[PDB]
């Protein structure tokens, strides 16, 4: 069969030959008990760059050994892309959320041998699930592969914003000292109130990690967490998110983007936050009105904003979030650390082997399976 | 009496007229039970910049309304300095560890009226303790005032180094995207081996904060912690520093600088660290041989180094740590956030009121009292 795999570009100076470390930490399961990916074998060394075009998710040898074809490209935007071009007869499509190959209804329609749409990561927002359901395309993802990676990024950014790390580092790097210039916008995180919009795998991991900082934890979600979890973390529930904002010094967004949540942070809802509040958003760029956020930082309503998700993405070279005051942005990378890559590359292989040997794909990985949401 | 108070310079754009937020979070005690400072009154608003020359630790009104003189300066180095000139007849000398007025044997000998040497912060290594003992000078500090502040800075820097945040932020800032350039030196912290050299107020506050990150915790110290604490954090004890190094992914230094620990991190001991380890040092700059650390980063043996302490301080504009690869440095600021400042300006006032009224200074604040170390 034919596997069409869309990956991001290699580094500026080439594909790395040498890495900072020899191995990766051993983990057996994810919080809650889900086990880590269980492929029959892997043809990469954990820690190597796997999500770039030269890493190939460590799949070529396995695929070619069972007489399958592996097409790897980074060109996936438009009708004239390699991806569109190769889609027609690909049996399997693989892409990561970090450089996604959108499976529009149109493409799904022209995708004649398409049986499996695999997300090497988490998050199939780039896929049209109705069309896959109708056309009987199985949609799978490597559940939990990077939830912890994202939660780490969130806590890092909260600390960095509150403590004014980025500006302080600049003074050091540029030959300065200027203690008062660093600390006139620096606070401790201890005892501040922090709230999460949604408490799913990432939101819960974030709350767990913040607890020992002796912050007061708040959350809002579609449904409340089990009472014992609320008790263990001393959580304060908010039935509406607009009720949670005014009492929080820090708000982290960990919810999906829907029409209901598009632009949920705008000039109007920003007026509900306390003066000097901080926002961290590693969820979707468009949860926030780009200009509303920029205005809040320029004016001082907000004391910091950080995340790794933007709109549009890739972000334009002049996107105002790159240079607005008190930002802690990064490009879209939180779930594509070398560590997270080793898990989703292994997960990707495990699913392929299942699909090819006729075995069932773990239920946890399945999104759309055979005419329906599974 | 005459109070000589050495503080750091105001911000380059002047003393702030405005701040990012309106108030500070409420805390009643430090971990273990110690209460926060209890002066009879304060003449500042918590959240203002107090550690710089125009802040004056919020002390002038109190001192001048009681017939005392307050001399505030940042000029403290050498014999022609305002500090050296005024020291001859000062009754009390106050300075912070971030901009320390050194009380060498020679200066103590010249300070004829010296009765109280107060550290507005923690750590009195800028004071010759034997000379103070020999001259009956009381040496006090505001115990616990920024231990949590430092601990938060340590965890922030650990996360930042491991996840390669600083270089990722620069790609964003500069108009790039470059996912693979950001992640080819990016890992998750989860399940790494983290060790602390000493487990004092700061070291233990660091351990507690790292636990939920699901790291494996290690420590070494002069004495072992109680078995209950060891069992609650699942700590692995190492009797020596050299025994601990080789099993750790991240090493944080939270111990004092003595002849014994001076240059404890050097070309030889660095050979014991695993390839790609990280070091965080918010203790003292001289615990590390400056050039051996630079060389380890340059040669790829070490994957990152961060801290806020340097040798010497202020660091010369060409100090190698400013620009060595994979550094996460800041000027010496961890314990001087606006929040920490409010606690040590309040404790400074508490201590002075006790001193001037002949009431005993709290036992936990005393370093040297009545010709002996307390």
UniProtKB/Swiss-Prot annotation, chains A, B:
Where is the site described as Important for catalytic activity found in this chain? 284, 332
Give the location in the cell: Cytoplasm
Superkingdom in the source lineage: Bacteria
Instruction: Name any Gene Ontology BP term.
Output: formate catabolic process
PROSITE patterns in the record, alphabetically?
Answer: D_2_HYDROXYACID_DH_1, D_2_HYDROXYACID_DH_2, D_2_HYDROXYACID_DH_3
User: Where along this sequence does the record place binding of NAD(+)?
Assistant: 147, 201-202, 221, 256-260, 282, 308, 332-335
Q: Where does substrate bind?
A: 122, 146
Q: Which GO terms describe its cellular component?
A: cytoplasm
Q: What is its EC number?
A: 1.17.1.9
Per the UniProt entry, the effect of residue 255 to S/M is: High resistance to inactivation by Hg(2+), Increased stability at 25 degrees Celsius and decreased thermostability at 45 degrees Celsius
Its main localization is cytoplasm
Stored SUPFAM superfamilies: Formate/glycerate dehydrogenase catalytic domain-like, NAD(P)-binding Rossmann-fold domains
Annotated GO molecular function terms are: formate dehydrogenase (NAD+) activity; NAD binding; oxidoreductase activity, acting on the CH-OH group of donors, NAD or NADP as acceptor
**Swiss-Prot/TrEMBL keywords:** Cytoplasm, NAD, Oxidoreductase
* Reaction(s) this enzyme catalyzes, per UniProt: formate + NAD(+) = CO2 + NADH
* HAMAP family, sorted: Formate_dehydrogenase
Question: Which family does the UniProt entry place this protein in?
Answer: Belongs to the D-isomer specific 2-hydroxyacid dehydrogenase family. FDH subfamily.
Biological role stated in the UniProt entry: Catalyzes the NAD(+)-dependent oxidation of formate to carbon dioxide. Formate oxidation is the final step in the methanol oxidation pathway in methylotrophic microorganisms. Has a role in the detoxification of exogenous formate in non-methylotrophic organisms.
Q: How does it assemble?
A: Homodimer.
The protein here is known as Formate dehydrogenase
Q: Provide the species name.
A: Pseudomonas sp. (strain 101) (Achromobacter parvulus T1)
């Amino acid at each position: 069969a034919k596997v069409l795999c869309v990956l991001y570009d290699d580094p500026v100076d080439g594909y790395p030959k040498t890495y900072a470390r020899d191995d990766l930490p051993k983990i057996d399961h994810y919080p809650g008990g889900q086990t880590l990916p269980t492929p029959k074998a892997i043809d990469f060394t954990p820690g190597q760059l796997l999500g770039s075009v030269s890493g190939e998710l460590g799949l070529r040898k396995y695929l070619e050994s069972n007489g399958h074809t592996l097409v790897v490209t980074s060109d996936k935007d438009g009708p004239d892309s390699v991806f569109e071009r190769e889609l027609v007869d690909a049996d399997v499509v693989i892409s990561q959320p970090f450089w996604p190959a959108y499976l529009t209804p149109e493409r799904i329609a022209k995708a004649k041998n398409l049986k499996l749409a695999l997300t090497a990561g988490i998050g199939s927002d780039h896929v049209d699930l109705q069309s896959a359901i109708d056309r009987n395309v199985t949609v799978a993802e490597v559940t939990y592969c990077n939830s912890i990676s994202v939660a780490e990024h969130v806590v890092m950014m909260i600390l960095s914003l509150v403590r004014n790390y980025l500006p302080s580092h600049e003074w050091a790097r540029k030959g300065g000292w200027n203690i008062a210039d660093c600390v006139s916008h620096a606070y401790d995180l201890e005892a501040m109130h922090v709230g999460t919009v949604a408490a799913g795998r990432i939101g819960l991991a974030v709350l767990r990690r913040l607890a020992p900082f002796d912050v007061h934890l708040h959350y809002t979600d579609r449904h409340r967490l089990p009472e014992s979890v609320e008790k263990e973390l001393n959580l304060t529930w908010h039935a509406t998110r607009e009720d949670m904002y005014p009492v929080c010094d820090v708000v982290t967004l960990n919810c999906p983007l829907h029409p209901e949540t598009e632009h949920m942070i705008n000039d109007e809802t920003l007026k509900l936050f306390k003066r000097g509040a901080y926002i961290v958003n590693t969820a979707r760029g468009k949860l926030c009105d780009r200009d509303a956020v920029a205005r809040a930082l320029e004016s001082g309503r907000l004391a910091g904003y950080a995340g790794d998700v933007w709109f549009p993405q890739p972000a334009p070279k002049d996107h105002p979030w790159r240079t607005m005051p008190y930002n802690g942005m990064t490009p879209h990378i939180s779930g594509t650390t070398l560590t997270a890559q080793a898990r989703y590359a292994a997960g990707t292989r495990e699913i392929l082997e299942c699909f090819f040997e006729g075995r069932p794909i773990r239920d946890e990985y399945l999104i759309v399976q055979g005419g329906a949401l599974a």
